[PDB]
Amino acid sequence: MLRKDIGIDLGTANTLVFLRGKGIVVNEPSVIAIDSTTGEILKVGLEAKNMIGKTPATIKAIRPMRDGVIADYTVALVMLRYFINKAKGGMNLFKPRVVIGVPIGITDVERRAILDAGLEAGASKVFLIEEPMAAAIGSNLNVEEPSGNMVVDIGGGTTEVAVISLGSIVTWESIRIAGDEMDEAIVQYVRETYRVAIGERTAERVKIEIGNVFPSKENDELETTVSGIDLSTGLPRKLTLKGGEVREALRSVVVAIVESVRTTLEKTPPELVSDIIERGIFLTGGGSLLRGLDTLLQKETGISVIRSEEPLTAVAKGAGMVLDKVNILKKLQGAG
Numbered sequence: 001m002l003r004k005d006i007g008i009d010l011g012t013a014n015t016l017v018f019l020r021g022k023g024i025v026v027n028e029p030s031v032i033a034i035d036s037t038t039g040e041i042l043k044v045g046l047e048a049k050n051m052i053g054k055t056p057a058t059i060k061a062i063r064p065m066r067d068g069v070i071a072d073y074t075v076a077l078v079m080l081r082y083f084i085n086k087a088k089g090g091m092n093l094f095k096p097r098v099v100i101g102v103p104i105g106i107t108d109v110e111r112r113a114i115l116d117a118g119l120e121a122g123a124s125k126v127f128l129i130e131e132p133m134a135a136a137i138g139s140n141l142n143v144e145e146p147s148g149n150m151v152v153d154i155g156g157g158t159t160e161v162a163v164i165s166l167g168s169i170v171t172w173e174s175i176r177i178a179g180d181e182m183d184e185a186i187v188q189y190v191r192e193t194y195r196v197a198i199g200e201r202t203a204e205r206v207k208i209e210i211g212n213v214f215p216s217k218e219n220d221e222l223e224t225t226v227s228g229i230d231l232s233t234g235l236p237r238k239l240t241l242k243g244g245e246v247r248e249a250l251r252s253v254v255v256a257i258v259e260s261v262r263t264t265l266e267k268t269p270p271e272l273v274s275d276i277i278e279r280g281i282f283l284t285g286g287g288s289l290l291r292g293l294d295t296l297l298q299k300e301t302g303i304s305v306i307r308s309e310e311p312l313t314a315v316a317k318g319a320g321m322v323l324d325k326v327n328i329l330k331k332l333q334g335a336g
Contacts, residue, residue, distance in 0.1 A: 003124065004096035006087055007320025009134070009313075010080065010114075012065040013156030013179055014286060015045075016313055017087040018138075018320030024313050025087050032079045036060045044082045053199040067176040068103035068131070068157035069110040070117065081121040095124035099319040099332070101131040103158040105174030115335040125336035127329065129322055130169055131155065131315050132162035135284050137325070138317030139308055143167055144327065148268075148275030152261055152297065152305075153315070154178050154287035159257050161264040163272050167328045171268045173260040179287035181253050182207055189249030190226060196237055198228035207290070210243045213254045214292025219243040222291075243291075250290070258300050265301060277303055284308030285315075 007018035010030065017026035028045030035042060036058055043051070051061040064076035088096060098118050102111065111128055118126030132151040136143045141164070143149060149164040156179035162172040186203035190196050203226075210222035222243035230237040261281070265273060283294050283305050294305040308314055322328050 002092065003094040004088055004092065005320060005323040006084060006096050006098045006123075007134070007316050007318065007323070008080075008083070008087075008098060008100045009131075009315035009319065010065060010076075010083075010100055011155050011157065011286070011315075012063060012068060014312070015079070015083050016316035017083055018313070018316040019087055020320050020323060024316060025089075026083050027313075028083070030065050030079065031061055031063050032075055032082075033059055033061045034075075041078060041082075044079055053201055066157060066180070068155065069106055070113050073113060073117065077117045077120055080117050084121050084123065091122075095122055097125045097127075097323055098123035099127045099129050099134075099322055101134045101315045101319050102128045103174050103176075104130045104132065104160055104162060104169060104172050105158070105176075111333060115333070119336050123336060125334060127322075127332040127334040129319050129332055130160070130162070131158075132160045132172070133164060133169060133328075134316075134318030134322065135308070135314040136164050136282070136318065137321050137328070138314035138319075139282065139284065139310070141282065144325075148272035148279060149282065150264070150268075150276045150279075151282045151284065152257075152288065154257065154283075154285040155315075156180050156287060159260055159287070160285075161260050163264065163268045163276065165272060168331070170272060171264055173264045175256060175260050177253055177256045178285075179207075182211070182250055182287065182290070185249050185253055186246065189245065190228070190241070191231070193245070194239060195231045196226070196228050196239060197231055198226045202226050202228065206241060206246060210241065210246050210291075211250065211289075212243050212247050212291035213250055214295045215244075215247065216292065219247065219291055222246075254290075254293075254296070258297065261297060261301060265303075280304035280306045282306055282308060284311045286312050
């Protein structure tokens with residue numbers, strides 16, 4: 001196409017870009033590294049993320065997106081522009097149409113900030129789409145049908161729970177407790193339990209390697225090691241963590257997620273709840289990969305929980321795909 005159609009999952013942790021007719025063309029951490037004094041852009045993406053917790057005073061590794069929205073506008077803009085340009089494979093004579101995912105609980109001010117960023121970033125037209133909706137579309141769930149589709153989307157910034165029907169969200173809950181809060185909980189557990197200071201990236205690695213929320217011998221037996229500073233001696237220290245401890249460290253976050261799902265179901269229209277019981281709950285998002293999360297939610301809700309086939313790319317895919325679905329596109333907020 002001359003005018004590209006782009007779908008963007010601008011996450012607090014990772015940014016995915018879908019290009020209609022090509023697929024996912026961008027999959028990089030939502031991090032930008034700059035020279036702390038001049039403001040020169042040093043790196044964007046993976047090379048920038050690799051700097052987190054390891055930068056000299058002359059470099060600042062920034063994650064402009066937080067809680068599913070723009071935390072630092074000027075930096076978010078530069079990052080967004082970089083990713084869009086990269087998605088287009090170089091500037092074209094015609095500015096692309098762009099759809100960006102947003103949390104349902106986003107405010108009008110936060111919405112406008114993203115629309116403006118999109119236009120300044122080079123889009124001819126920008127549209128905003130709720131993440132769970134994009135996630136459902138990207139997963140080929142027939143969102144336009146009058147059939148209850150409950151999606152639990154856990155990203156890095158927010159946990160979104162929505163019951164979808166007729167191309168729209170009927171009931172929902174949006175909490176700013178997700179992937180980032182999980183890493184944070186691990187960092188905190190280690191500090192409090194062992195008086196050892198570890199970084200955000202080490203905590204994330206632990207989450208990925210042995211993160212789990214359902215008790216089982218298998219999960220309890222999972223183990224890995226973390227390295228940091230023993231705050232009692234000031235000496236470097238390596239220690240082993242087992243699944244049981246990580247599950248406990250994640251208890252509060254899980255409780256909050258379980259509660260958001262339970263709360264949404266309770267206020268969902270009965271006919272839709274009837275559909276959900278038959279259809280099951282769809283679990284997706286990068287933050288939903290915790291071991292036994294589907295098992296836990298199924299036990300807590302009494303309803304079958306099905307994991308997304310492509311939990312990381314669903315939102316970007318849907319955002320791109322909606323550009324070819326007029327009936328849904330028509331209802332999205334836009335600018336340009």
